[PDB]
């Protein structure tokens, strides 16, 4: 059929997700991970939803910035495939060790 040797799929979904507004990580598993990390320093803590939404917002923004500088590291690497030490170099330069 119309199998399409690639190129339009990835960039088209980039166009869609940059036309987009809202989140990408869906709610419940992120919330449960938050509560598992939360169950480590003081037990049995309760939460309002807006805090969790802010956490999700800033989390996705943090990772978006990581991906942007990682992308520019890859472009300077004359590649399009990412690597882990790209992210390690990015966090090395960001001073967030």
């Amino acid at each position: 059929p119309h199998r399409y040797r690639p190129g339009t799929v990835a960039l088209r979904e980039i166009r869609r997700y940059q036309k987009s507004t809202e989140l990408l990580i869906r709610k419940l598993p992120f919330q449960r991970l938050v509560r598992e990390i939360a169950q480590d320093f003081k037990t049995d803590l309760r939460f309002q939803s807006a805090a969790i939404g802010a956490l999700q917002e800033a989390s996705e923004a943090y990772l978006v910035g990581l991906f942007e500088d990682t992308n520019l590291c890859a472009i300077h690497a004359k590649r399009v495939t990412i690597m882990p030490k790209d992210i390690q170099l990015a966090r090395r330069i960001r001073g967030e060790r």
Binding site: I14, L24, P29, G53, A61, Y62, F67, A74
Partner: protein
């Protein structure tokens, strides 16, 4: 337990696409999980400490706002 593995590969894909990343390697996902985890560790530690002095067993949005302002990763939107 294991909600660290609740992070899905297509979510990482979606974040890469809004992040503008085209090509995805396979050795990326658990590294991503670890960085996200350490991030949220420092965040929720500080927020819970702000709530420790608050003498209220419930953490508010305002608390997390103030704590992330303390990190300098400061986010608007919810007041604080």
């Amino acid at each position: 337990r294991d909600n660290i593995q609740g992070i899905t590969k297509p979510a990482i894909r979606r974040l890469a696409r809004r992040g503008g990343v085209k090509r995805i390697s396979g050795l990326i996902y658990e590294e991503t999980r670890g960085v996200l985890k350490v991030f949220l560790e420092n965040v929720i530690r500080d927020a819970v400490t702000y709530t420790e002095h608050a003498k209220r067993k419930t953490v508010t949005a305002m608390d997390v706002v103030y704590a992330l302002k303390r990190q300098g990763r400061t986010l608007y939107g919810f007041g604080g």
